[PDB]
Design an enzyme around this catalytic site. Structure first.
Site, PDB file in Angstrom:
ATOM      1  CE  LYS A  13      27.686 -22.364 161.924  1.00  0.00           C
ATOM      2  NZ  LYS A  13      28.994 -23.079 161.871  1.00  0.00           N
ATOM      3  CE  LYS A  73      25.422 -26.951 160.505  1.00  0.00           C
ATOM      4  NZ  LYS A  73      25.813 -27.299 161.867  1.00  0.00           N
ATOM      5  CD  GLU A 164      38.163 -30.636 162.961  1.00  0.00           C
ATOM      6  OE1 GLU A 164      37.791 -29.911 163.921  1.00  0.00           O
ATOM      7  OE2 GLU A 164      39.353 -30.658 162.551  1.00  0.00           O
TER       8      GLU A 164
HETATM    9  C1  LIG Z   1      38.037 -28.466 160.338  1.00  0.00           C
HETATM   10  C2  LIG Z   1      36.770 -27.697 160.609  1.00  0.00           C
HETATM   11  C3  LIG Z   1      35.758 -28.264 161.349  1.00  0.00           C
HETATM   12  C4  LIG Z   1      34.537 -27.595 161.549  1.00  0.00           C
HETATM   13  N1  LIG Z   1      33.489 -28.263 162.128  1.00  0.00           N
HETATM   14  C5  LIG Z   1      32.312 -27.666 162.138  1.00  0.00           C
HETATM   15  C6  LIG Z   1      31.168 -28.359 162.663  1.00  0.00           C
HETATM   16  O1  LIG Z   1      31.216 -29.528 163.044  1.00  0.00           O
HETATM   17  N2  LIG Z   1      29.976 -27.671 162.737  1.00  0.00           N
HETATM   18  C7  LIG Z   1      29.854 -26.364 162.298  1.00  0.00           C
HETATM   19  O2  LIG Z   1      28.729 -25.809 162.360  1.00  0.00           O
HETATM   20  N3  LIG Z   1      30.933 -25.686 161.818  1.00  0.00           N
HETATM   21  C8  LIG Z   1      32.099 -26.300 161.745  1.00  0.00           C
HETATM   22  N4  LIG Z   1      33.218 -25.607 161.305  1.00  0.00           N
HETATM   23  C9  LIG Z   1      33.086 -24.224 160.807  1.00  0.00           C
HETATM   24  C10 LIG Z   1      33.985 -23.241 161.580  1.00  0.00           C
HETATM   25  O3  LIG Z   1      33.409 -22.960 162.828  1.00  0.00           O
HETATM   26  C11 LIG Z   1      34.133 -21.919 160.827  1.00  0.00           C
HETATM   27  O4  LIG Z   1      34.933 -22.055 159.630  1.00  0.00           O
HETATM   28  C12 LIG Z   1      34.706 -20.796 161.683  1.00  0.00           C
HETATM   29  O5  LIG Z   1      33.771 -20.491 162.706  1.00  0.00           O
HETATM   30  C13 LIG Z   1      34.881 -19.540 160.877  1.00  0.00           C
HETATM   31  O6  LIG Z   1      33.600 -19.389 160.190  1.00  0.00           O
HETATM   32  P1  LIG Z   1      33.559 -19.117 158.581  1.00  0.00           P
HETATM   33  O7  LIG Z   1      33.788 -20.521 157.952  1.00  0.00           O
HETATM   34  O8  LIG Z   1      32.163 -18.522 158.328  1.00  0.00           O
HETATM   35  O9  LIG Z   1      34.625 -18.098 158.214  1.00  0.00           O
HETATM   36  C14 LIG Z   1      34.426 -26.264 161.119  1.00  0.00           C
HETATM   37  C15 LIG Z   1      35.519 -25.645 160.502  1.00  0.00           C
HETATM   38  C16 LIG Z   1      36.635 -26.358 160.153  1.00  0.00           C
HETATM   39  C17 LIG Z   1      37.739 -25.653 159.397  1.00  0.00           C
END
Ligand SMILES: Cc1cc2nc3c(=O)[nH]c(=O)nc-3n(C[C@H](O)[C@H](O)[C@H](O)COP(=O)(O)O)c2cc1C
Ligand SMILES: Cc1cc2nc3c(=O)[nH]c(=O)nc-3n(C[C@H](O)[C@H](O)[C@H](O)COP(=O)(O)O)c2cc1C
Lengths: 216, 216
Positions: A13, A73, A164
């Site tokens: 984050k 970020k 995304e």
């Molecule tokens: C396709 C995709 C889009 C995501 N978009 C964002 C985003 O815009 N902002 C963000 O803070 N996290 C984003 N995430 C992170 C996801 O929230 C995160 O992978 C999920 O909460 C599980 O957390 P982890 O990656 O720590 O296991 C995204 C994840 C994916 C796979």
């Protein structure tokens, strides 16, 4: 162990702007993007890798609007990858791919090459002609690349976050992507987390397998 | 080293039916499926893991007709994973996810949990209400899981092949998926290649970075 990597990685984050990828890691992340599998080895993708302050700022303009939480970020990470999909699957591209497979030595005969091309055109035509879903199909291949990438960079010891939450129209306009035959889908900043990354110390959460998984 | 894994992995064309995943590896592949990231931790997926002769044969029915070249891969592999996406994103599921995040200890307060849910519903609603593309969106998350999976199993020392060449309608019908709110997208046999895997010794081919990759 790769299961450790999978259990310990996390969506970062906040990044430490003073902490760069090594020049070696900057080569390695490019290798990961390149060598991802794809349906028919179609490779229907383009990557923008922004590592300069000017480059990252161009990307970060896409985190306008409701997407300001993501802007930092993009600015503070070492390297920022924009995953782009092709907008249409053309014959020029299919010829490029099979000619590369040939140059790399994958065909014992001319016949084998012809058959590979006929196979790939047939399968691609199914998506552009009959189903009219080739944009969605190509985008899926790109998401597959992302998934490969996220585990890869984790295994190299790097922090990252898939994003995304950005405006693809802004990003596409900024790099003239529509004119070149691409559209942005996912932005992935890569680097090292800062102390402001609250998600670094939170426990990981997933639904249990008794909901998401069946054995037969 | 993960770059080695990336450069050496390959789509297996033939499996050795006599070589099974160890009990431990069978648990590990399930961990990989479970712990993949997804947009908003939405986890909009189901996995079928077929390891018995009866189970694998049910899956392989989807590769009769025009997809026979893939049928033998599904029969001969140790374990066969069907990646399924949800067909619609419902509030029951969103509540399940945030309640799990809560059970896992990711919220210091009730406020923080409310905000996470409002955040996720807002983002999900953008796909189902406006856009009307939540099926495509959820499917992309599943492809991301596949990408993660393929590198994961390679890093465990296992062979695999992603398969889109199957009839999803047959597979969905066979496991009553439509009624339960899912659709099959990708089948991934996992095991060990046989000597009949011609692709094991063929050089890997990718388009050069001077086409697919821009630095800024
Ligand atoms: C396709 C995709 C889009 C995501 N978009 C964002 C985003 O815009 N902002 C963000 O803070 N996290 C984003 N995430 C992170 C996801 O929230 C995160 O992978 C999920 O909460 C599980 O957390 P982890 O990656 O720590 O296991 C995204 C994840 C994916 C796979
Ligand atoms: C989404 C997807 C679908 C695929 N479908 C099939 C398939 O139906 N049959 C098959 O033999 N290989 C299939 N492949 C394997 C690809 O041909 C392969 O990934 C590509 O040629 C690159 O070679 P590699 O996987 O050995 O790196 C598929 C790949 C992906 C990613």
């Amino acid at each position: 162990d790769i299961i450790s990597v999978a259990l310990k990685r996390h969506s970062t984050k906040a990044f430490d702007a003073s902490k760069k990828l090594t020049p070696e890691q900057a080569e390695q992340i490019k290798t990961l993007l390149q060598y991802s599998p794809s349906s028919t080895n179609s490779q229907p993708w383009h990557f923008i890798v922004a590592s300069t302050e000017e480059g990252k700022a161009r990307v970060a303009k896409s985190a306008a609007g409701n997407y300001v939480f993501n802007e930092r970020k993009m600015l503070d990470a070492s390297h920022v990858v924009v995953f782009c999909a092709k907008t249409a699957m053309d014959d020029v591209w299919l010829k490029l791919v099979v000619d590369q497979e040939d140059a790399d030595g994958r065909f014992a005969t001319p016949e084998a090459k012809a058959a590979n091309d006929k196979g790939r055109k047939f399968f691609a035509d199914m998506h552009r002609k009959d189903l009219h879903d080739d944009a969605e199909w190509m985008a899926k291949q790109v998401y597959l690349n992302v998934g490969n990438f996220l585990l890869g960079v984790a295994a190299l010891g790097l922090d990252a976050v898939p994003i995304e939450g950005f405006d693809a129209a802004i990003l596409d306009a900024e790099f003239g992507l529509k004119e070149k035959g691409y559209t942005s889908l996912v932005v992935v900043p890569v680097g090292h987390h800062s102390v402001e990354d609250f998600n670094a110390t939170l426990p990981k959460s997933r639904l249990p397998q008794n909901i998401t998984l069946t054995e037969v």
